[PDB]
RNA sequence: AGCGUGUAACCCCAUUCGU
């Protein structure tokens, strides 16, 4: 009758309650508990592992690597920005837009 | 190629040559409303849509009046509209429910953003 | 409180059992009103017949 | 305390109150510009430019809507917002119910493997005895 | 100038003072 012993113990269902920030330190913010810290702790751990993965890939980078995407795109400060494609309008088309606007 | 192109303009002989209508901003607006009919009435539940896209062959019409259904089933001519979306614009019951749901989501989302 | 009387407890179990069965099977209804549609969609891709072989 | 006039005073800090927390948002990761250049081409992050600027002569006036179609267009977006929320909420309910079902299933195979080994155990001994005879004839063939 | 995403001095041109 092990289950009978457990059922008697769980007759009362009041659980322990959480304590708040002291009043004289209320402007600082909420008092963080283990559940609150785990959110910011896992967030920092997530980013550091990704940065370490990025830094290791830079070690075996070959400066002589070549791609056909490289021909039409130039880096800007080292960042690969994809510039928007041009429209290539013609003077005859340009005159039609202005007549439609008026 | 040209004989293939002619055959895709119609549904076929199995459905007596239904044509694919030209898609417009008023026709597309009606078909989008029909897909989202589950959320119009909170007390009505519908099955899943047959297809995620729009049907290629379809036609638009109205239900003919019957002399027997003068009181049982007939809408007065003042309440009738030209399109499905204008019918949704007219009825108070759908507008009253939808604005409460939409405001609740934004009020929830404003708290979410903050 | 429902545990106090075993008769009303069995009454509630039957009421839930009919609700759960509604998912499995469709209940029969008469034409008490003139036909006006399904109240729901008509799915044309679902094939619910039983093959005989 | 009853004999004298002493009255209980309760500390405000010691009392229990609802916390009423709000969820926390974190900044997106910033990759140094030196690191982006050092990265190989396959692993390089590639983004699209804003290019908001347009010359005065090239730009065109915006469409001016009649109030009628704005009523129709606002109605569809409000209906679309409600419908999108409903499907996403229903997806999680499907995700949750399927989760316990898979968890419920895994309990039986844990039990199933237990009867599997015990039933095989009695048969295993008979097979092992046959292998003994193969040792004596292993050298002979 | 160059390292450093957790809700610039120094230098340089000129002004004044003075063993």
Q: What is the distance between the alpha carbons of residues D36 and A80, in angstroms, rounded to a whole number?
A: 8
Burial of D135 (0-12, 13-18, 19+ CB in 10 A): exposed
**Token code pair at residue D19:** 């916390």
Q: What is the distance between the alpha carbons of residues A17 and A36, in angstroms, rounded to a whole number?
A: 16
Decide if C45 and B72 are in contact by the 8 Å CB cutoff: no
Asked if B33 and D76 touch (Cβ cutoff 8 Å), the reply is yes
Decide if C44 and B50 are in contact by the 8 Å CB cutoff: yes
DSSP assignment letter at D28: P
A57 contact residues in D (CB cutoff 8 A): 39-40, 43
DSSP run (H or E) holding A80 = strand A80-82
CB neighbours of residue B33 within 10 Å:
20
CB-nearest to C43 from B44, B47, B72 is B47
Instruction: State whether residue D27 is helix, strand or coil.
Output: coil
Spatial neighbors of D82 by CB under 8 A, at least 6 apart, are B39, B98, B101, B102, B105
Q: Please give the nucleotide, over all strands, whose C1' is closest to the CA of residue D22.
A: E7
DSSP assignment letter at A23: G
DSSP run (H or E) holding A82 = strand A80-82
DSSP assignment letter at D46: E
- Residue B19: φ, ψ to 5°: -100, 150
Distance from CA of B59 to the nearest CA of C (A): 17
**Token code pair at residue D1:** 């305390």
**Token code pair at residue A18:** 């959480």
- The technique by which this structure was obtained is cryo-EM
Residues in chain D: 141
Q: How many CA atoms lie within 13 A of B39 on its CB side?
A: 26
For the CA atoms of D18, D19, D22, D27, the dihedral, rounded to the nearest 10 degrees, stands at -170
Q: Left (φ > 0), alpha (ψ -120 to 50) or beta: where does D22 sit?
A: beta
Taking alpha carbons only, the member of A84, A72, A81 closest to residue D54 is: A84
Spatial neighbors of B29 by CB under 8 A, at least 6 apart, are B83, B85, D72, D76
Instruction: State whether residue B19 is helix, strand or coil.
Output: strand
Asked if B50 and C44 touch (Cβ cutoff 8 Å), the reply is yes
Count of helices and strands (H, E) across chain D:
2, 1
């Amino acid at each position: 009758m092990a289950a009978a012993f457990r059922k008697a113990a769980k007759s009362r269902q009041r659980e322990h309650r959480e304590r708040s920030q002291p009043g004289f330190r209320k402007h600082l913010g909420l008092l963080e508990k283990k559940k609150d810290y785990k959110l910011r702790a896992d967030d920092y751990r997530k980013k550091q592992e990704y940065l370490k993965a990025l830094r290791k890939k830079a070690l075996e980078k070959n400066p002589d690597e070549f791609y056909y995407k490289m021909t039409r795109v130039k880096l800007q400060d080292g960042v690969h920005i994809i510039k928007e494609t041009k429209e290539e309008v013609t003077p005859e088309q340009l005159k039609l837009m202005r007549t439609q606007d008026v | 190629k040209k004989r293939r192109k002619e055959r895709q303009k119609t549904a076929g002989d199995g459905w007596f040559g239904m044509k694919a209508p030209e898609m417009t901003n008023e026709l597309k607006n009606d078909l989008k409303a029909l897909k989202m009919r589950a959320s119009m009435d909170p007390k009505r539940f519908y099955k899943k849509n047959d297809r995620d896209g729009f049907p290629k062959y379809f036609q638009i019409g109205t239900i003919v009046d019957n002399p027997a259904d003068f009181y049982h089933s007939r809408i007065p001519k003042k309440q009738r509209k030209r399109t499905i979306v204008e019918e949704l614009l007219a009825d108070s019951e759908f507008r009253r429910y939808n604005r409460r749901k939409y405001s609740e989501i934004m009020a929830e989302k404003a708290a979410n953003a903050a | 409180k429902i545990d106090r009387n075993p008769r009303v407890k069995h009454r509630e179990k039957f009421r839930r059992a009919k609700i759960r069965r509604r998912g499995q099977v469709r209940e029969v209804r008469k034409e008490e009103q003139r036909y006006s549609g399904e109240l729901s969609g008509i799915r044309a891709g679902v094939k619910k017949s039983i093959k005989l072989k | 305390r009853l004999a004298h006039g002493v009255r209980l005073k309760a500390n405000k800090d010691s009392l229990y109150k609802p916390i009423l927390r709000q969820k926390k948002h974190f900044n997106s990761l910033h990759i140094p510009k030196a690191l982006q250049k050092a990265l190989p081409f396959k692993n390089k992050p590639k983004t699209q430019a804003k290019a908001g600027k347009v010359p005065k002569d090239r730009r065109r006036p915006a469409v001016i809507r009649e109030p009628h179609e704005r009523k129709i267009l606002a109605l569809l977006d409000a209906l679309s917002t409600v419908h999108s929320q409903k499907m996403k909420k229903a997806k999680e309910q499907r995700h949750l119910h399927n989760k316990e079902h898979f968890r419920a299933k895994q309990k039986e195979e844990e039990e199933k493997l237990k009867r599997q080994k015990d039933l095989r155990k009695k048969l295993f001994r008979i097979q092992g005895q046959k292998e003994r005879r193969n040792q004596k004839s292993s050298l002979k063939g």
